[PDB]
Amino acid sequence: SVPSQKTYQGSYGFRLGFLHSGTAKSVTCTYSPALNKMFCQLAKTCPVQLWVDSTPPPGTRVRAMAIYKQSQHMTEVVRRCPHHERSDGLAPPQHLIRVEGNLRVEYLDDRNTFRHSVVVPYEPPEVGSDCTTIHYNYMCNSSCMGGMNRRPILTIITLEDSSGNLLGRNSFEVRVCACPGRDRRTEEENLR
Amino acid sequence: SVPSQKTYQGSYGFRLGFLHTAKSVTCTYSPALNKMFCQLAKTCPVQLWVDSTPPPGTRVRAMAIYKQSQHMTEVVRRCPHHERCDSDGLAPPQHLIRVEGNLRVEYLDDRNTFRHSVVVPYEPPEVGSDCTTIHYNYMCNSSCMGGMNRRPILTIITLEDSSGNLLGRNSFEVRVCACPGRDRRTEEENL
Amino acid sequence: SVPSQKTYQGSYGFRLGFLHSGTAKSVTCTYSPALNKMFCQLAKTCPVQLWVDSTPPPGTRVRAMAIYKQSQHMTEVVRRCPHHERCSDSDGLAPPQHLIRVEGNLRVEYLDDRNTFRHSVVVPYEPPESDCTTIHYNYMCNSSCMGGMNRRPILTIITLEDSSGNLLGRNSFEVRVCACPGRDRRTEEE
Amino acid sequence: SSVPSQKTYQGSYGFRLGFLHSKSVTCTYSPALNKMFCQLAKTCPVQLWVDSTPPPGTRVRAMAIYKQSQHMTEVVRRCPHHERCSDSDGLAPPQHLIRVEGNLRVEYLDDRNTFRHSVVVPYEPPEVGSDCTTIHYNYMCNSSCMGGMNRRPILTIITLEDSSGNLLGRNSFEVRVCACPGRDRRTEEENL
DNA sequence: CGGGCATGCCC
DNA sequence: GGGCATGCCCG
DNA sequence: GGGCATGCCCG
DNA sequence: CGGGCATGCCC
Ligand SMILES: *C[C@@H]1C(=O)C2CCN1CC2
Ligand SMILES: *C[C@@H]1C(=O)C2CCN1CC2
Ligand SMILES: *C[C@@H]1C(=O)C2CCN1CC2
Ligand SMILES: *C[C@@H]1C(=O)C2CCN1CC2
Ligand SMILES: *C[C@@H]1C(=O)C2CCN1CC2
Ligand SMILES: *C[C@@H]1C(=O)C2CCN1CC2
Ligand SMILES: *C[C@@H]1C(=O)C2CCN1CC2
Ligand SMILES: *C[C@H]1C(=O)C2CCN1CC2
Ligand SMILES: [Zn+2]
Ligand SMILES: [Zn+2]
Ligand SMILES: [Zn+2]
Ligand SMILES: [Zn+2]
């Protein structure tokens, strides 16, 4: 079954935050609140903030998974194109989404659905901060032929206990493109 | 190594011909550039013109190479995406160049140079015709990532005997694109 | 014995020309007239123009050779550093030890001189398509490489030769291979 | 190549390392980073402290590995320039990064199975009136050497072993070989 | 930092 | 055919 | 000890 | 694009 994308704050008040990087043409990543859509470049750092009202228990994990947004493509596993599949020392070459700068990263190929995901332990924010940040990398362009092939995707962020039970969920659309600033302005202008 | 490009009409007067830039054209040839513009997997007719007919057993080989000397040693092959596609029943999935409509087509993977080539027997022109046309197919765009990767290529057409000895050679540049008529006008106007 | 660097226009009025690309920090190759010095990045295209008053005969060749500019280093052969001489930058035609390559010419020829041990690269002269024939040189080590040039400045000598090697003309220019030619040209000119 | 263990192991003899007290200085050790900053080919003293005297024939082996997990499987060796510099003392083969000075009983190993380099000397008990044994190490490449360590930080693994090579103890410390150890220690400390 | 264009694709 | 979608070369 | 030389990084 | 850091080296 297609994994759920429904927003769910859960008993810890789980919410996502994003950096507000603007729409300069050269911007490596930028988030559009009006679209709830992240625009980023291939393999560049894509910060995602985790916000909670109450700290989840030790053993809590944070999983990221991509699915196709269009209903006719939702049952197809999101994976890297054959060119980019051919790197780093921790992530499987087939996985679209990586976590950088975290040696506790763990990747999953699902036994039943064959979907890819990446999971890290939830770590509480630093003494001064009010949120925890994960540095994601997207390893294919949305336009990659033989891969996403111009099909829009969503990234589903799930807060899990140690057993994998759901504690909270949030999602956002992603476009991996060469020009995130240009493309965000173009789509937001097309809301008019 | 690097195969020869030298035009060589040889003992039989071997030369190439091409049919005769709108944005609908499946293929278009530029005499000014000696360059064929064609779309992926669409008919690319090349005419064989000879002054004298070659003997029975003569073969016609086609091979692609990169035009730039910095890439000329790299084997031209299909990109990873299209390699994973669309066979006609005989063409191996990694070969860039195919021949359509010839049951006697042979595809060669050289055991030593690793270069790909496609070979058909030479047929004399039909009654009333003064040339023999072979319908080639290019199975990747010049821009295909992980393949030609926007590098221009040349197609080398060689006339060979059954033993592989050279009888004649010609060549032409080729760009496999989505809008051949458009790119031909741009290149001819950027000179 | 050090190869000659004496400018000689010869019977064909042989001069060099360079593209004027400014001093932006990311410029891949820029020429300073005040210094007669080329600032370029490693393995990037460095255009050198050949200007002649009359077309030299067929068979004419164009050779490029690097020598150290300082007199106390002039007898040392300019070569790549031990690190770079082990890469795979091949290009299919160039020797791994040679500092200077020509890109985009299948008729390129490289020489290790049997007597002087010096490296040079030669291409056939081809008439302009332009008022000038351009050769695309690549320099395969930074001026600062340890065990190679080691921050010593070099001169590139361009010689026009007939098919037998006789001198038809000669010109030269200083070269710095660096990460940021735009920044370094400004610093050296200041 | 498989990565040698870095696990601290005091062993039956309570083996531990010590360092002398610390911008013109040739070497300096930072307790906050467990990191040694030293100059190329300069004396880098390392103290051996034991609670009990190991048996005769015990040896002390030093081996370098890259600290980052990405480069951990790569053998640490001298850059091509320094390997050709012929700056040998007469004992160390030119490819070895780590040398021992002032000990003619030194032995250098090019492991036939792992291809790792190491340098080993006999363990000498502390002299009368002393509490530790000092080995004077030399590092023959800067951390920044192109074609060698190439700005990748390394760890030095010191092992105590018997005559046959069996492990008796292990410690480790990060090391940066640079031109100005005092400047670079101050810089790295001040970034924490 | 990115302007300008290459190149697939849709109307 | 006009124009958009979307990557990238070189400063 | 400043401070420059110079490869590199970062968007 | 430049700003500026990393880092060997010079006064
Ligand atoms: C949104 C709802 C809930 O509150 C839980 C988790 C997700 N769905 C179904 C049950
Ligand atoms: C949009 C992207 C960028 O960030 C710069 C300017 C245009 N493209 C390629 C490089
Ligand atoms: C969400 C948190 C904070 O409180 C500040 C700004 C972004 N992160 C890290 C520090
Ligand atoms: C040039 C090509 C074609 O053949 C049609 C019309 C314009 N483009 C895309 C489809
Ligand atoms: C040298 C010649 C010319 O006259 C211009 C500038 C560079 N080349 C080609 C065109
Ligand atoms: C000067 C060099 C370059 O060309 C760019 C900008 C600054 N450095 C590194 C990348
Ligand atoms: C840091 C190093 C030193 O040890 C002295 C002073 C500054 N540099 C070069 C010499
Ligand atoms: C081992 C220890 C001692 O006993 C003195 C000499 C060396 N080290 C510091 C002081
Ligand atoms: Zn891809
Ligand atoms: Zn393809
Ligand atoms: Zn070098
Ligand atoms: Zn070194």
Q: What is the 3-state secondary structure (H, E, C) of C83-141?
A: CHHHCCCCCCCCCCCCCEEECCCCCCEEEECCCCCCEEEEEECCCCCCCCEEEEEEECC
Give Cβ neighbours of residue B63 (< 8 Å, ≥ 6 apart): B3, B97, B115, B116, B117, B155, B156, B158
Per the CB < 8 A criterion, the answer to whether C172 and C8 are in contact is: no
Contacts of B80 in chain A (CB under 8 A): 81-83, 85-86, 146
Distance of residue D101 Cα from the nearest chain C Cα, in angstroms: 25
* Pairing, β C61-68 against β C154-161: antiparallel
Nearest residue to D47 (alpha-carbon basis) of D111, D108, D127, D152: D127
Sequence-ordered list of residues with C-beta below 8 angstroms from that of B89, at least 6 positions apart, any chain: none
Cα C153 to Cα C130: distance, rounded to the nearest angstrom: 32
Write phi, then psi, for D149 (nearest 5 degrees).
-65, -30
The amino acid occupying position A122 is: Y
Question: In whole angstroms, what is the distance from residue B16 CA to residue B81 CA?
Answer: 32
Q: What is the total residue count of chain D? A: 192
First-to-final CA distance of chain A: 36
Cα C180 from chain centroid?
18
* B139 close to B100: Cβ distance less than 8 angstroms: no
Main-chain phi, psi angles of D133, to 5 degrees: -105, 135
Distance CA(C137)–CA(B103), nearest Å, equals 49
C178 touches C142 (CB < 8 A): yes
DSSP B83: H
In chain E, which nucleotides are within 7 Å of a protein Cβ?
A: 1-3, 6-10
Question: CB under 8 Å to D160, separation ≥6 — which residues?
Answer: D11, D13, D15, D54, D58, D59, D60, D123, D167, D168, D169, D170
Tell which residue, D110, D79, B69, D149, has the closest CA to residue C85. Answer: D79
* Helix, strand and coil percent figures for chain B, each rounded to 5: 10, 35, 55
**Closest listed residue to residue A36, CA positions, set A78, A7, A74, A12:** A7
Q: Using the CB atom, is residue A81 less than 7 Å from strand F? A: no
State the DSSP H helix or E strand holding residue A185, giving kind and residue range, or none if neither. helix A180-189
Measured from the Cβ of residue A34, the count of other Cβ atoms closer than 10 Å reads: 9
CB C65 within 8 A of CB C100: yes
Q: Which residue of C has its CA nearest to B74?
A: C92
Say if residues B146 and A83 touch (Cβ distance below 8 Å). Answer: yes
User: Nucleotides of chain G within 7 Å of a protein C-beta?
Assistant: 1, 3, 5-8, 11
Say whether B181 sits in a helix, a strand or coil. Answer: helix
| Atom of ligand 2 at shortest range from CA of A26 | 4
Residues A165/A3, Cβ–Cβ less than 8 Å: no
Burial class of A104 by CB neighbour count within 10 A (0 to 12, 13 to 18, 19+): exposed
Task: Measure Cα distances from C147 to C72, D83, D84, D85 in Å.
Answer: 17, 11, 9, 9
Inspect the structure and tell me whether chains A and C have 3 or more CB pairs less than 8 Å apart: no
Contacts of residue B78 in chain A, CB cutoff 8 Å? Answer: none
Q: Which among D64, D62, D59 has a CA at the least distance from the CA of D46?
A: D62
Q: Is the CB of A27 under 7 A from strand E?
A: yes
CA–CA dist C180, C184 (Å, integer): 6
Provide the strand spans (E) within chain D: 16-18, 27-30, 35-38, 44-49, 59-66, 98-100, 107-110, 117-122, 133-139, 154-161, 167-177
Instruction: Let me know: does D152 contact D74? Beta carbons within 8 Å.
Output: no
**Cβ contact A28 with chain G strand, < 7 A:** yes
Distance in angstroms (rounded) separating the CA atoms of residues C5 and C158: 9
Counting ligand 8 atoms within 8 A of each CB, the residue from D46, D51, D127, D131 with the most, and so the one to mutate, is D131
From B40, B179, B185, the mutation candidate for ligand 4 (largest count of ligand atoms within 8 A of CB) is: B179
Q: Which nucleotide is nearest to C146 (CA to C1')?
A: H8
Number of CB atoms found within 10 A of residue A43's CB: 17
Tokens 């090019």 belong to residue = D110
List the structure tokens of A177: 């493109």
The CA distance from D115 to C163, in Å, is: 51
Task: Determine the atom of ligand 4 nearest the C-alpha atom of B182.
Answer: 1
Determine whether the interchain pair D84/C83 forms a contact, defined as Cβ–Cβ distance below 8 Å: no
Do residues B51 and B159 touch, judged by C-beta distance below 8 A?
no
- Quick one: resolution in A? 2.0
SS3 D162: coil
Phi, psi of D67 (to 5 degrees): -75, -35
- Contact, B183 CB vs strand E, < 7 Å: yes
Cβ-based neighbour number of residue D22 at 10 Å: 13
**Six-digit token string for C77:** 């052969």
Going from the C-alpha of B74 to that of each of A54, B107, B153, D149, the distances in angstroms are 59, 19, 11, 32
d(CA B175, CA C159): 37
Q: CA-CA distance, C144 to C41, in Å (whole number)?
A: 12
CB count, 10 Å around CB of B3? 16
* Cβ neighbours of A41 (radius 10 Å): 19
Which of A49, A53, A132 for mutating ligand 3's site (highest number of atoms within 8 Å of CB)? A49
Distances in whole angstroms, Cα of residue D183 to Cα of each of D24, D26, D38: 9, 11, 11
**Any chain B CB within 8 A of the CB of C108?**
yes
Rounded distance between C-alpha atoms, residue D134 and residue D125, angstroms: 10
Question: What are the Cα distances from residue D31, in Å, to A27, D21, D173?
Answer: 40, 10, 10
Measured distance CA(B20)–CA(B65) in Å, rounded = 25
Quote the ligand 2 centre to B153 CA distance (angstroms). Answer: 28
Q: Which residues contact C72 (CB under 8 A, 6 or more apart)?
A: none
What does the angle CA C26 – CA D191 – CA A120 come to, to the nearest 5 degrees? 90
DSSP β-bridge partners for residue B133: B47
Cβ pair A103:D70 closer than 8 A: no
Biggest CA–CA distance in chain A, Å, is: 46
Count helices and strands in chain C by DSSP H and E runs: 1, 11
Residue A53 vs residues A8, A11, A18, B165, C180: alpha-carbon distances, Å? 13, 9, 17, 80, 49
Is the separation of the CB atoms in C56 and C147 below 8 Å? Answer: no
Ligand 3: residue whose CA is nearest its atom 1: A131
Looking from the CA of C10 toward its CB, the CA atoms found within 13 Å total 21
Read off the tokens for D28. Answer: 């300096």
Burial class (CB in 10 A: 0-12, 13-18, 19+), D65: buried
- What the block records as the tokens of C55 is 């077309």
CA-CA distance, B130 to B127, in Å (whole number)?
A: 8
Q: Give D84→chain C minimum CA distance, Å.
A: 8
Type of residue found at D164: S
Q: What distance in angstroms lies between residue D169's CA and the mean position of ligand 5's atoms?
A: 71
Of all nucleotides, the one whose C1′ comes closest to residue B22's CA is F1
- Which method resolved this structure? X-ray
CA distance B154 to C84: 32
Interface subset of A 130-169, CB within 8 angstroms of D: none
Helix (H, G, I), strand (E, B) or coil at D154: strand
DSSP-based three-state secondary structure for D109:
strand
Please give the Cα distance from B155 to B145 (Å, whole number).
20
Measured CA to CA in angstroms, residue A127 lies from A124, A131, A132 at distances of 9, 10, 11
Partnered with residue A171 across adjacent β-strands are A156
Half-sphere exposure of D4 (CA within 13 A, CB side): 25
Smallest CA–C1' separation from D181, nucleotide:
H7
First to last CA, chain D: 33
Query: What's the rounded Cα separation, in Å, for the pair D6 and B129?
Result: 80
Distance between CA atoms of residues D83 and B160, nearest Å: 53
Mutation target vs C (from D40, D81, D144; most C CBs, 10 A cutoff)? D81
Q: Do D81 and C86 touch (CB under 8 A)?
A: no
Angle at C178 between CA C175 and CA C180, to 5 degrees: 120
Residue with tokens 């006008």: B185
Q: Which residue of B has its CA nearest to C106?
A: B69
Alpha helices in B32-132 (DSSP H): 80-83
β-sheet bridge partners, residue D109: D118
Q: What is the 3-state secondary structure (H, E, C) of B120-179?
A: EECCCCCCCCCCEEEEEEECCCCCCCCCCCCCCEEEEEEEECCCCCEEEEEEEEEEECCC
CA C185 to chain centroid, in Å, comes to: 18
Which residue's CA is minimally distant from atom 1 of ligand 6? C180
Task: Report yes or no: D99 and D92 within 8 Å, Cβ to Cβ.
Answer: yes
Structure tokens, C16: 């060099």
Q: Exposed, middle or buried, B9 (CB in 10 Å: 0-12/13-18/19+)?
A: middle
Tokens of B134: 């072979």
Question: What is the interface size between C and D, counted as CB pairs within 8 Å?
Answer: 25
Closest by CA position to B37, among listed B116, B142, B190, B150: B142
- Separation between Cα atoms, residue B165 and residue B156, nearest integer Å: 15
Separation of CA D119 and ligand 12 centre (Å) = 18
Pick the closest to residue C152 from C92, C76, C96, C69 (CA basis). C69
Closest chain A C-alpha to B25 CA, distance in angstroms:
24
Q: Among all residues of chain A, which has the CA nearest to that of B145?
A: A83
**CA–CA separation, A78 vs A95, rounded Å?**
8
CA separation for the pair B40, D172 (Å, rounded):
60
How many angstroms separate the alpha carbon of residue B93 from the centre of ligand 3?
A: 52
Q: Token match 């400018």: residue?
A: C7
Greatest extent of chain B over all pairs of C-alpha atoms, in Å: 45
Chain A residues whose CB is inside 8 A of the B84 CB are 82, 146
Token pair recorded at residue C3: 């190869």
Residue C67 sits at the vertex; the CA angle it makes with C63 and C71, to the nearest 5 degrees, is 145
* Three-class DSSP category at B16: strand
Q: Which amino acid is at C84?
A: H
DSSP per position, A30-91 = EEETTTTEEEE-TTS-EEEEEE-SSPPPTT-EEEEEEEESSGGGTTSPP---HHHH---SSS
Closest CA to D169 of D87, D23, D81, D49: D49
Of D90, D80, D177, which Cα lies nearest the Cα of D137?
Answer: D177
Nearest-angstrom CA–CA distance, D111 and D96: 12
C-alpha D49: how far from chain center: 15
Q: Please give the Cα distance from B154 to A40 (Å, whole number).
A: 37
* H/E run at residue D80: helix D80-83
- Which residue reads 């299209």 in tokens? B82
Size of interface A-D (CB pairs under 8 A): 5
CB contact under 8 A, A88 and D69: no
> Nearest ligand to the C-alpha of residue B177?
4
Residue whose CA lies closest to nucleotide E5 C1': B186
Give residue A99's identity as a one-letter amino acid code.
Answer: V
Question: Which residues from chain C sit within 8 angstroms of residue B73, using beta carbons?
Answer: 92
- Cα dist. A12→A8, C114, C184 in Å? 10, 79, 56
Which residues of chain D lie closer than 8 angstroms to A103, CB-CB?
69
What Cα–Cα distance (Å) separates residue C151 from each residue in C34, C158, D180? 20, 22, 20
C98: closest CA among C83, C115, C79? C79
Exposure string of C34-58, with b = 16+ CB inside 10 Å and e = fewer, is: eeebbbbbbbbebbbbbbbeeebee
Rounded distance in angstroms from the CA atom of residue B150 to the C1' atom of nucleotide E5: 14
